[PDB]
Design a protein around this ligand. Structure first.
Ligand code: FAD
Length: 391
């Protein structure tokens, strides 16, 4: 018995959720995964802790999915970030909410998430065959044939959830784009998004340090969020978002305290004209950031003159950084681009050109910010694709 109602290709967050919803709707379901493990990429989101969704409202979500979020109104009315939170709560996983509405398991371990998903697939009788790479997908009359090098399976409904093109060592190497092409869909241009930034800058002084809520500016686009200093330059949300507007050759500007304007700072110093300038700023900033700003200046806040005060403050508020480029698609967190949404039903996620065929997750031309919006996007679209609609 190799024939199923539904076959789902790719066991990421989209694939797992379609397997759950399809089974739940009485569909006899097969999930195929190329790796020995499910959720290889998912296991590494949120610094490996697993950033499973975001707890904001609908507008927070739309602001979180800049790349074609508007297509998801229909999907989100069926299953949303709060349906996700319910599911994991219902099934005995303790979630928690961190900054910017990011949702993690209390365990801080991605296996708590993936293991819960596998457990449900099993309670619902879903079939999963791992360590199996699909190489071929055809359709005859009303019957999809799905083939690996060894075997073949059949179905009437086919869900393709093979992901994007970034981090191909997770398994997302584009096969779902080939399917889409084979059945004569348009695949848009595939390019990097949420790609960390290469800077020309003394990286050693600051790498590993994290900063909460800072403003990076460049031309019209100005962004206020979290930032990580890396050995190659800049990552974390702020860098990641800005990375869409920048290619290499630009100067961008960093505001390390968007809270205080020039004057508040000036006043703050006078209150601590007794401590060392490093120690002064050590109270407002992480220590290694303090070192960085105040190395070239006099030891003590009072030893400063007027011109030193004004120059220092302008560095604190407007440090110019030189960007020499960004990471490629391969090394970016998100693929901007995918299967074209003008040929997909926004409500069922069925292809408009081939009946029975469906697409969910990153394989579609949807792209979002890190912070749970991609994963939320994949679980939901997955849920919908796997679910049944009739009329
Ligand atoms: C380091 C990192 C951190 C991230 N952090 C975040 C974050 O904090 N928040 C956020 O929202 N997003 C984040 N993302 C993005 C997010 O992980 C993805 O957008 C999401 O996992 C996509 O889900 P998916 O199921 O569509 O594709 P994937 O999760 O990639 O899964 C696709 C699956 O298809 C399988 N497959 C592929 N080809 C075949 C084939 N031929 N045969 C069989 N199986 C196949 C693959 O093995 C894979 O398991 C991050 C990405 C990375 C790389």
């Amino acid at each position: 018995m190799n024939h199923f109602d539904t076959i789902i290709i790719g066991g990421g967050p989209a694939g797992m959720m379609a397997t759950i919803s399809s089974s739940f709707y009485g569909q006899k379901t097969l999930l195929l995964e190329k790796n020995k493990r499910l959720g290889k990429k998912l296991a590494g989101t949120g610094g490996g802790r697993c950033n499973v969704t975001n707890n904001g409202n609908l507008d927070d979500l739309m602001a979180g999915i800049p790349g074609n979020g508007r297509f998801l109104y229909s999907v989100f009315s069926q299953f949303d970030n709060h349906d996700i939170i319910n599911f994991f709560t219902e099934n005995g996983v303790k979630l928690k909410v961190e900054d910017h509405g990011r949702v993690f398991p209390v365990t801080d371990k991605s296996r708590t998430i993936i293991e819960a998903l596998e457990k449900k697939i099993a309670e619902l009788g879903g079939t999963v065959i791992t360590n199996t790479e699909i190489v071929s997908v055809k359709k005859t009359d009303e019957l999809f044939t799905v083939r690996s090098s060894d075997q073949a399976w059949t179905c009437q409904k086919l869900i393709v959830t093979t992901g994007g093109k970034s981090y191909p060592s997770t398994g997302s190497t584009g096969f779902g784009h080939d399917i889409a092409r084979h059945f004569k869909h348009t695949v848009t241009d595939l390019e990097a998004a949420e790609s960390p930034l290469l800077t020309d800058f003394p990286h050693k002084a600051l790498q590993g340090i994290s900063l909460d809520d800072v403003t990076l500016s460049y031309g019209k686009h100005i962004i206020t969020h979290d930032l990580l200093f890396t050995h190659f330059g800049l990552s974390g949300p702020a860098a990641l978002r800005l990375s869409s507007f920048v290619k290499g050759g630009e100067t961008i500007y960093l505001d390390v305290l968007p809270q205080m304007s020039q004057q508040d700072l000036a006043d703050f110093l006078e209150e601590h004209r007794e401590k060392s300038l490093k120690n002064c700023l050590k109270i407002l900033l992480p220590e290694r950031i303090a070192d960085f700003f105040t190395q070239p200046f006099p030891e003590k806040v009072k030893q400063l003159n007027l011109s030193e005060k004004e120059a220092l403050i302008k560095q604190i508020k407007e440090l110019p950084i030189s960007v020499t480029g960004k990471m490629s698609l391969a090394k970016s967190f998100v693929t901007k681009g995918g299967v074209s949404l003008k040929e997909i039903n926004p409500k069922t996620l069925e292809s408009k050109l081939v009946p029975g065929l469906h697409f969910a997750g990153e394989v579609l031309d949807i792209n979002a910010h890190t912070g749970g919006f991609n994963i939320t996007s994949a679980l939901c679209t997955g849920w919908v694709a796997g679910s049944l609609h009739y009329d």
